[PDB]
Design a protein around this ligand. Structure first.
Ligand SMILES: *[C@@H]1O[C@H](CO)[C@@H](O[C@@H]2O[C@H](CO)[C@@H](O[C@@H]3O[C@H](CO)[C@@H](O)[C@H](O)[C@@H]3O)[C@H](O)[C@H]2NC(C)=O)[C@H](O)[C@H]1NC(C)=O
Ligand SMILES: [Ca+2]
Ligand SMILES: [Zn+2]
Ligand SMILES: [Zn+2]
Length: 783
């Protein structure tokens, strides 16, 4: 019943026996002498010359005795003060070409140093405030910033780090949440969070244990001082070979706590950052004492940033809703709304939509949230969501705090940090910003583990690593296209469409020709599911036409910097032409659109960008038509007539691939036919939930998009196909005052589109597949 000989033991005792491990305090289950024997404070955390060679006194917090390495309970500066060695931070960086590990070590250990609320810009504070951190950052591998997951709160992000999964998939969708199947709520405070029922996926410590690799206890009771957490890691690293973990985690509550109290750019922030640096320095000195400083891979990572947020920037729901007693709100930097008793969700949303000119939040049904957030597919996510403006809070009803976080994960102030240091990371290497869902694959690689299935894209971070355990391979195409000829005659169609000579004298009409070379610059997308579709070629564009969904899965075209924009002449406004290459039965019909009072149609390739009046007639083929709400046509037509040409002008030409997305179950994945819940009336033409475009050009803008030697540059979006423009509060103005702002909100990665369509892009380029995976994970943020 005593913690003697057992402090911070790895085996977990009881219930009910008294525990002496990392978490015993959190359960209020430690042995009576835990706080006495294990949380020793006497004489602080640094050796002084007068202690060198002292007799071991057990009440000392750390030791300067000659027996202190045999336990690894020496103070971390022991050798510096007593044996003439130097501080890790004062040593020159020297490349670590191979792991330099001592006797007994069969792989490089991994230590994860997680710092709560460490904003990316704090790194700009430099080596006068954070000398140890700046050394890790400059000698190792680092990104200018790492993007967290939404919501940008600690539990969702630390668990995403651990699992490689979006919160919707791992289950930790908030710091607070209610589960209607358990009928219970989870909170930062209390016991409920300790119940395994809440935690899904497979976190790294479980992946490791399952594959025979020992993991240290990642979690730390808040009562354990940071210095004792470092000393405990060093103690574990000193254990025999058959008991020593290979992976460890340190967690610090700072700089988050001071960020909340003083704001991100308060002068008070410098002290907490100095203290974090000290802790890193203690870890590095400690490793160096154990001859592990050129053997361990260290990951210094944050979970989210911090924004300026004060009391008097609070919107209150009682100022919008007359029935605020009927609802339960999860409040703050995001809002989630539920009924108090299992109120009407459609009236709640309408009552919160564009009611005040400076309104600092926007309501969404969860399925209408931007797809890049991946924040819908979980019963813990309430149907009603408030996306709150940066710098603001939302509360239910009507200063000690100056900072908060939780906002949209593309907001600048929410970005966090990443540095990788050690033999397996690259040397003095800067890498592009990347998302925190990508690290679990890399941590697995670093430990020799096979990752469990996750939302990372394995290989998209190979460029962080000196030597890679994993080489990606491009997936095999599942469906092979048909390339149908001009088989059928005009008179065989009656699709109910109308139109209003030279195409009879063109024998080579709709043949491959030079269409593939100029309009598919990166190869045909591959179709990764079973379906039947047709490649269709035209002077100005190429498309993959689905005989099942009666529309293209994709439409590809290139527009040069010098492309002319033209009008749809009035004699062609209502023109729709039957496609002589596709059968009537696998074609859309115009009558269904005339029968459907809510629904109109648009075109994937824009008639506005035709290369000639002759070629413009191709844009009106029934195989280029897609169902579109009139409200959405305002957005689409502006995109196609104005913004594509702008992008072409700014980027030295662009290649565009556009198409429909069906995601009626909001799982982020391509719907099967059975899952499509809306069709054009009286018809079998499915209604898309979204429309995507992927806009590619040369990263070197001095080369045109069709003559690009090197790295590519991409921006993409996934626009919600909505029958109104209630999302955009300025929509009653000219499209130039609101459409582009809409599209920027709905920016997306190419990977997001691949999941939602079952397509694989960029299969024929001069780049390596690893480089391509990096491109596919890129998000253009507009921040
Ligand atoms: C993010 O990653 C997770 C994990 O890879 C993805 O969740 C997984 O989704 C698949 C497909 O829906 C689920 O697998 C299915 O299992 C059953 C048979 O047991 C069968 O009905 C299907 O044919 C398929 O095998 C799986 O449950 C699920 N795994 C987890 C942990 O949730 C998720 O789709 C990813 N999200 C995105 C947007 O890519
Ligand atoms: Ca789906
Ligand atoms: Zn946090
Ligand atoms: Zn916080």
């Amino acid at each position: 019943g005593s913690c003697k000989g057992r402090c911070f033991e790895l085996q977990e005792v009881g219930p009910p026996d008294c525990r002496c491990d990392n978490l015993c305090k959190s359960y209020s289950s430690c042995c009576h002498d835990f706080d006495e024997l294990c949380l020793k404070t006497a004489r602080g955390w640094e050796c002084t010359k007068d202690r060198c060679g002292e007799v071991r006194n057990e009440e000392n917090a750390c030791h300067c005795s000659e027996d202190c390495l045999s336990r690894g309970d020496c103070c971390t500066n022991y050798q510096v003060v007593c044996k003439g060695e130097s501080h890790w931070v004062d040593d020159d960086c020297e490349e670590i070409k191979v792991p330099e590990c001592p006797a007994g070590f069969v792989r490089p250990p991994l230590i994860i140093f997680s710092v709560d609320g460490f904003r990316a810009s704090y790194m700009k504070k430099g080596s006068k405030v954070m000398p140890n951190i700046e050394k890790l950052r400059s000698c190792g591998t680092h990104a200018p910033y790492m993007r967290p997951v939404y919501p940008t709160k600690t539990f969702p992000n630390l668990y995403t780090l651990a699992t490689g999964l979006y919160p919707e998939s791992h289950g930790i969708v908030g710091n607070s949440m209610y589960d209607p199947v358990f009928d219970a709520s989870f909170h930062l405070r209390g016991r409920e969070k300790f119940n395994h029922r809440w935690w899904g996926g497979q976190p790294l410590w479980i992946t490791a244990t399952k594959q025979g690799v020992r993991a240290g206890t990642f979690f730390w009771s808040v009562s354990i001082p940071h210095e004792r957490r470092i000393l405990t890691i060093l103690q574990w690293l000193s254990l025999p070979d058959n008991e020593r973990p290979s992976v460890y985690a340190f967690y610090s509550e700072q700089p988050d706590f001071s960020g909340h109290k003083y704001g991100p750019f308060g002068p008070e922030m410098t002290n907490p950052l100095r203290e974090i640096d000290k802790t890193v320095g203690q870890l590095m000195d400690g490793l160096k004492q154990l001859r592990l400083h050129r053997c361990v891979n260290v990951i210094f990572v944050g979970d989210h940033g911090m924004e300026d947020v004060t009391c008097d920037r609070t919107e209150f729901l009682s100022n919008y809703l007359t029935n605020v007693d009927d609802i339960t709100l999860v409040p703050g930097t995001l809002g989630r709304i539920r009924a108090k008793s299992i109120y009407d969700p459609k009236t709640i949303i309408a009552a919160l939509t564009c009611k005040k000119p400076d309104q600092h939040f926007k309501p969404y049904m969860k399925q209408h949230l931007p797809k890049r957030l991946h924040y819908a597919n979980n019963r813990r996510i309430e149907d009603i969501h408030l996306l709150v403006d940066r710098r603001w809070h939302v509360a239910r009803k009507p200063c000690f705090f100056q900072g908060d976080h939780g906002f949209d994960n593309k907001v600048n102030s929410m970005q966090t940090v990443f540095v990788g240091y050690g033999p397996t990371f690259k040397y003095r290497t800067k890498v592009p910003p990347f998302e925190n869902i990508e690290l679990y694959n890399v941590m697995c690689d670093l430990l020799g583990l096979k990752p469990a299935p996750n939302n990372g894209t394995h290989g998209s971070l190979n460029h962080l690593l000196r030597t890679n355990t994993f080489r990606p391979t491009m997936p095999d195409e599942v469906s092979r296209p048909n390339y149908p000829g001009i088989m059928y005659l005009q008179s065989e169609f009656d699709l109910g469409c109308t139109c209003d000579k030279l195409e009879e004298l063109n024998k080579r009409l709709h043949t491959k020709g030079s269409t593939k070379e100029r309009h598919l610059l990166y190869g045909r997308p591959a179709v990764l599911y079973r379906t039947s579709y047709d490649i269709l070629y035209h002077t100005d564009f190429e498309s993959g036409y689905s005989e099942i969904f009666l529309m293209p899965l994709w439409t590809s075209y290139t527009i040069s910097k010098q492309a002319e924009v033209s009008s749809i002449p009035e004699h062609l406004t209502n023109c729709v032409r039957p496609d002589v290459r596709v059968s009537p039965g696998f074609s859309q019909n115009c009558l269904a659109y005339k029968n459907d009072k809510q629904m109109s149609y648009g075109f994937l390739f824009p008639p506005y960008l035709s290369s000639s009046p002759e070629a413009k007639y191709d844009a009106f083929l029934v195989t280029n038509m897609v169902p579109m709400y009139p409200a959405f046509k305002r957005v689409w037509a502006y995109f196609q007539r104005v913004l594509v040409k702008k992008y072409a002008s700014e980027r030295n030409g662009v290649n565009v691939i556009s198409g429909p997305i069906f995601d009626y179950n909001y799982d982020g994945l391509r719907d099967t036919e059975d899952e499509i819940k809306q069709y054009v009336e009286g018809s079998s033409i499915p209604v898309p939930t979204h429309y995507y475009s992927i806009i590619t050009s040369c990263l070197d803008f001095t080369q045109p998009a069709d003559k690009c030697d090197g790295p590519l540059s991409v921006s993409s979006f996934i626009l919600p196909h909505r029958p109104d423009n209630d999302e955009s509060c300025n929509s009653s103005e000219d499209e130039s005052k609101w459409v582009e702002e809409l599209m920027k909100m709905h920016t997306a990665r190419v990977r997001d589109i691949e999941h939602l369509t079952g397509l694989d892009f960029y299969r024929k380029t001069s780049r390596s597949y690893s480089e391509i995976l990096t491109l596919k994970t890129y998000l253009h943020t507009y921040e």
